[PDB]
Amino acid sequence: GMTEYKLVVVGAGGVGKSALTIQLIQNHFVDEYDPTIEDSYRKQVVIDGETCLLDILDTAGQEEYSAMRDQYMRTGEGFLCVFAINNTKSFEDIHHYREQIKRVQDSEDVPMVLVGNKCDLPSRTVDTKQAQDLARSYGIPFIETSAKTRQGVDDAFYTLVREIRKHKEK
Ligand SMILES: Nc1nc2c(ncn2[C@@H]2O[C@H](COP(=O)(O)OP(=O)(O)O)[C@@H](O)[C@H]2O)c(=O)[nH]1
Ligand SMILES: [Mg+2]
User: Fold this and answer.
1) Ligand 2 centre from 20 Cα, in Å?
2) What is the effect of changing residue 35 to L?
3) Residues flagged as binding site for GTP
């Protein structure tokens, strides 16, 4: 059967996790998507000529119990850790999301990509060097994205799949 990559999108409210996921899946930019809604998406893609399925959980950081949330956090193969380049607080929050992933995976080596979203906006308060320095500290890729323009969106998800492939061949 076709290989499935189970991916989880995490980060502070308002960074564009839902917009990024819908851009990947539906190829349009959504201005308004309920900040409390957590849902999974499945998409067949070709990455470096490998036809595969992306099984993505768009997390919403809500209190209410979800069996699906626990399952994706436990069995997820890769995580997008998303901040917004015009939201210093969302960048300050990244370490908390990475710590949560390491604890649920019981691993120091979980495939992850650091995503700086909203790179279409001129009011950048988190610079490339700061983001590259954090990614280097974690030993993970840094990808700049815009859910609005689609800049870097395929690159973010496809880079995470390449990190998972590397982990599986370790
Ligand atoms: N300019 C810009 N706005 C964005 C981008 N991605 C998301 N947004 C906006 O940021 C707000 C929060 O996005 P959303 O996907 O709900 O964030 P989530 O809470 O992380 O799921 C919304 O008003 C979006 O339209 C982007 O790349 N550029
Ligand atoms: Mg959302």
Assistant:
1) 9
2) In NS3; characterized by a defective GTPase-activating protein sensitivity and a strongly reduced interaction with effectors
3) 11-19, 30-36, 60-61, 117-120
User: How far apart, in Å, do the first and last CA atoms of the chain sit?
Assistant: 22
The DSSP call for residue 112 is E
Q: Is residue 121 in contact with ligand 1, taking CB distance under 6 Å?
A: yes
What distance in Å separates the CA atoms of residue 98 and residue 102, rounded to the nearest whole number? 6
Q: What is the helix, strand, coil percentage profile of the chain, to 5?
A: 35, 25, 40
Nearest ligand, measured from the Cα of 22: 1
For tokens 């470096």, the residue is 48
Q: Which positions ≥6 away from 67 have C-beta within 8 Å?
A: none
Is the beta carbon of 31 within 6 A of some atom in ligand 1?
A: yes
* Fold assignment, 6-169: Rossmann fold (3.40.50)
From atom 2 of ligand 1, which residue's Cα is the shortest distance away? 118
| Ligand index nearest the alpha carbon of residue 14 | 1
Domain boundaries, the chain: 6-169
> What is the secondary structure of 6-55 as a DSSP string?
EEEEE-STTSSHHHHHHHHHHSS--S---TT--EEEEEEEEETTEEEEEE
